[PDB]
Design a protein around this ligand. Sequence first.
Ligand code: HEM
Ligand code: HEM
Lengths: 126, 129
Amino acid sequence: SSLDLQLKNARNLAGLIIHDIDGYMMKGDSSEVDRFISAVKSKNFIMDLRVFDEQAKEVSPTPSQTPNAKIQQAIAAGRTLEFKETLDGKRTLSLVLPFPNEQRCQSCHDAGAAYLGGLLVTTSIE
Amino acid sequence: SLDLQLKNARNLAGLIIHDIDGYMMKGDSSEVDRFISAVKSKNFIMDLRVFDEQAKEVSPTPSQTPNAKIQQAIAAGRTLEFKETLDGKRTLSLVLPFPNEQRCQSCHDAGAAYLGGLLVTTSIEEGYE
Ligand code: HEM
Ligand code: HEM
């Protein structure tokens, strides 16, 4: 179970990476390919990653009791938001999106929720 | 292009949500913090290499020596995956051929079915510890 999950996640990661690089291949510029590879392996590929509960309050990695406005909006509107920020001197893109409350989640979650929380991920675009 | 970066970022977010969905349905909600550390670590993308139609690496380390795995992926037109212990961790390396899709054909003559290959290595140690 734990291994299958790890394997599934790994295969999806590979799918993501080739789809990502396909966009760079479309440029017909080797320079762009080299830079992408360096960027995805770097520590700034995923500079931040936080998961929030339905109340827009962070749960992982650092539990908080203060709601995150962007998450609040993403959940309320049920849409993905994105905004630029300069973090530790780097230009980045942050995405905030809600977790759809699929029927299968009802076993442990409120079946009536539209969304079960949010995710915030920040990646460098330097 | 910012739009390309955004599209890619969007799919990254999608992967993460799909990954966490897995931990949840498997009853492993408590492993999310560990998942996050792993995703931000240098072990997420442990290696990434691109090869041409002759299975020779073009980036980031140009080589004239063919990669047997890539070679088979391209010749067979299929994705190969193998477990390997690297950098002190149990990992999964996936070898994928680049299909010459319609959009690609605007430059690559449709004669070739695949244009090369990609190797990606990620840690799967979390699956054991
Ligand atoms: C694909 C359906 C599901 C989705 C989208 C989902 C989503 C979420 C989200 C976004 C959170 C809040 C943030 C976090 O704790 O990291 C959460 C918390 C939680 N989920 Fe789920 N979940 C799903 C299925 C499940 C299932 C089936 C279980 C029961 C086996 C479960 C048990 C929990 C628990 C125990 C928490 C509390 C975690 C904590 O605060 O420490 N979830 N879930
Ligand atoms: C998603 C569709 C595409 C894929 C999958 C693709 C794949 C590849 C692969 C695997 C290589 C050899 C490895 C490498 O040099 O990195 C390559 C080289 C190349 N491709 Fe593409 N390609 C695509 C679209 C395009 C387009 C649309 C153009 C023209 C605008 C193009 C122009 C080139 C050029 C010029 C090279 C030679 C190396 C260089 O970039 O200087 N490719 N392509």
